[model samples]
Target: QLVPEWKDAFVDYSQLKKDLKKIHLFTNGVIQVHKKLASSGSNNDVYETELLEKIADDTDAAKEFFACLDMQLNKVNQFYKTKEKEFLERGECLKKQMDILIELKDAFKQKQANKKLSHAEKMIKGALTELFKGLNYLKTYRNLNILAFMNILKKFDKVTGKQILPIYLKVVESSYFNISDKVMILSDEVEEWFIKHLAGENRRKAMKYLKPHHRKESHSVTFFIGLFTGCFVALLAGYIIVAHLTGMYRQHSANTFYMETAYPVLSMFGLLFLHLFLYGCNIFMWRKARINYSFIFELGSKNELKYRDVFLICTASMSAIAGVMFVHLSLLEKGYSFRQVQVIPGLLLLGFLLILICPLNIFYKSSRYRLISVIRNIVFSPLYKVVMLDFFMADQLCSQVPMLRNLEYIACYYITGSYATQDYEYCMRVKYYRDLAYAVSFLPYYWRAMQCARRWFDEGETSHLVNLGKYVSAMLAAGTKVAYEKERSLGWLCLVVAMSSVATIYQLYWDFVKDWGLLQHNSNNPWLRNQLMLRQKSIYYFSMVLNLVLRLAWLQTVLHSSFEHVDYRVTGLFLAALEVIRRGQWNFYRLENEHLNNAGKFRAVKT
Candidate 1:
């Protein structure tokens, strides 16, 4: 498919087709007139005179037709000329880059290199890859424009009984876009240089980089998704039945132990599962909307995970968690010691961590490494340059404060030997633990704000500072809630309400106006923006309302509402899950806005 961003630079076939239709209609009318006049006079010279007179009388239609055709030709020529200039400039730059790369390689061979050869090689290869991509796009542009001109001219001839094809076709074939062979020659030279210098003299290896195969979605992924989903369903049902029989929820004392020790682990996994499932949904919808998410996120098409791959990961992970939790619960019911059964959750956590950092070429190694690197960038914040995915991931982490807190608690619980003694309160009672919990609650926003600061420093855009303020407000609101939880006084409550309300308003405005690019005052579609991916405008309105409502989830914290026979921890987990769900919904619109912005700039490739 043609790049969406470069669409305006491509053929205006649709407009040309409409113009041809107008010519067809006018020609039909002239043919009817010709038939009428021929019936009145059978003389050949009279007929010719009459036809010529009729044409001369109504020359405006032919003039308009040719004018439109010429306009199209000029437009195409101008666009092609500009692009050819750009590609030619890029080709020169590539030549210089290759020269530098060759020098670096030679220096390395002579043991005279100061910098690492691999890094230099990587930079050169990346430049070559982008150049090759542009060349391919240019090739497609040339072929498609030529085909469009040929088809449109043929249609004109068919409708008007004209012999203009030879004239127009010659002009088109001799056009600069069609005659240019520099792109093709440069493409071949690049392939040769890549093979000689970078590919260890292997043509096949170089071609792989020059023309990377797009991975097709596999049916096996679908089969495994269904398999794991069914397994998860069965295991969850069994766990529910087992929990009910043992009265795990009914008994208050036992429930507290489970909530303190086991619940955090299970809830953490549950939150992760929900996020992954929603991401899969986002991928599906983005694909349907024709969003170039891979390009936007800088994920190469070869290694990027498809929606089914995401679903497989989500379902498989949840199935593993449910299976382990079911076994852990079953063992507890069979009279296993608390210490022995508790280690199962710890082992499960360890296993997942091992899988994530596994150096072996298995379980989507590249994607796992990518996630790790992005997380590292997020944690380091200002140390790394902010990219689209980095900030996007940091936003996700903001919504996952509760999950991060759970992780902190789980880490402390396991490391301090609290699990072995069955002392759930040991981690809770420590002063350092409480302080760390506060830090955990604020860390995501802190990291996100730092990202904004970094972006501001890099781009010098005032909007980044404004966005940073949004996160700062969120931090203030979060700090007040944590303090209110600790003090539980009327003053802390007031502070919580005041800070949270302001933060909520700030976030809601940013979400609608900046993030989603909606709620425009003078937009064609009422409050929604002019460029919408979805057909139904009502979805945007509904989503705006939904986001506003979801932003008020902190109200439950203020109300201190409790469900009958349900622990507060469960309610807290439910609220956290709600925030995750809201973030998932936010993800769709956030990326949609990003995709729109990329299109506005005609950025089809990573810079």
Candidate 2:
């Protein structure tokens, strides 16, 4: 596009030629007439040489910048290559993870079949046991009435037959149900034919028109046994009265910042340093606590579930209290000026509680609570990272599963973070406000929970006594039929229904009716950007300001626009914006409704 209309000589060279015309800079590369120029010794010559040096330095600097850029790009390429290599090496791991997810669904299927088999075997065995019992009862009569006894046996067998058919029917209805398939298996015609056959007269009893909340998609979560399975705060006390005038020990440098004008910057730094100091303490505490709180487990156990709650809460509370005290002790300095008088006394009270009140309460030190607290503590600390580890692994493993693949890590951050307090809860059971959530989550798959019960059954073909009595027999029968393995079954349906119920109910109740819980009364009041003004009041204001400046201000100057302006009025307006941005200032009202053309009220974030 450039060559056809413009020749190579068209390149702009006016600045180059003009600068070259300046006297003084003389190169003797091929010059036969350098004597005239060398005789001048002119200041213009100095300027030209200086300009050439500046150009050379800039050229070298540009080359170095590009070299660094090349190294960074190489590093990025290596990262992607490493990631690809990892995926190739861990294909087998993906298979294992997929197996686990499959097992989640498969366990329910196997348990449904096992329950059916167990129930059927129990009925026949029970009849035999009863037969023997009847014979034992007849010993007293002396003359065994075979006819009457036979009739009794016949009745028993009849009752057994009635119950057995239902088991077979339900087994047909529940288990063989494409249980091996991950999703529902049905050709429309066959599914319709089967449902119609099963539902004929009972179709009228179908549960329709019911709200979504009543039905759940999943089964009873296995709790307490494996949790899963199948199966399955405070000791604070010693404060010695060592009053060595700690009150007057707060020595600080006046050189750090100006008195009133710089209190906020100082306050902000105070908070940030306090935060880091507390974090460092927690990290140290975690290592020590891990050692002090370690439990000996049965062989082959990671003890993931062991002693987490107790260790965590104590650490968190202690760290938090420690951080507050550190800030307080730091803030009590005499050099710094404060915006309000009360901020000092308020902090003193908080410091006193951390130092004195919390550590000594008898309840805080209970060994039982502490161990539980440790369990609570340890398990809870890595909750996010652990959960994300699972999720990120899932992302890599299930890259083919669209729903999970497309899902960003937002689920990890939000879904898992909600339970951040789980660590605290582990420290102590404050209450069970989420019980409704649990129940709503667990009903539909109650039969599948029979999977967990598989461990408890010890019945054998020869053990007549294990057979339940008639009443017990009936209950087992009922529970079993619902679990039967058939060509197609309801077990999987129940599990999906149970989980779905939880999501549906939570959404409906929280969305439609939750607003009624809020206060409706309105007050004729006004608000202001008073906190921007009050940032001066916070003791941590200084630390926060410094951090805000370094972290946020750097981005503004480099990552964002640093507009150039020559007009005095334009620059003044820009400076005004800068000051407002720096101080996080905001308006009391929208332009105050003072004048149509009055300056607009702009706002900024305070923290």
Candidate 2 per-residue lDDT over residues 170-273, each given as its tens digit: 22222211112211121121123223322234443322311123455233222221221110011111111111233331223333212221222223232332
- Evaluate residue 429 in candidate 2 and report its C-alpha lDDT on the 0 to 100 scale: 33
lDDT of 2: 0.27
Task: State every prediction's TM-score relative to the real structure.
Answer: 0.62, 0.14
Show model 1 residue runs off by greater than 4 Å: 1-218, 252-256, 482-490, 554-566, 600-607
Model 2 quality (TM-score) = 0.14
Model 1 Cα displacement at 104 (Å)?
A: 51
lDDT of 1 by residue, 371-412 (tens): 898999998877798888888888887667667766777887
Q: Against the hidden true structure, what lDDT does model 1 obtain?
A: 0.73
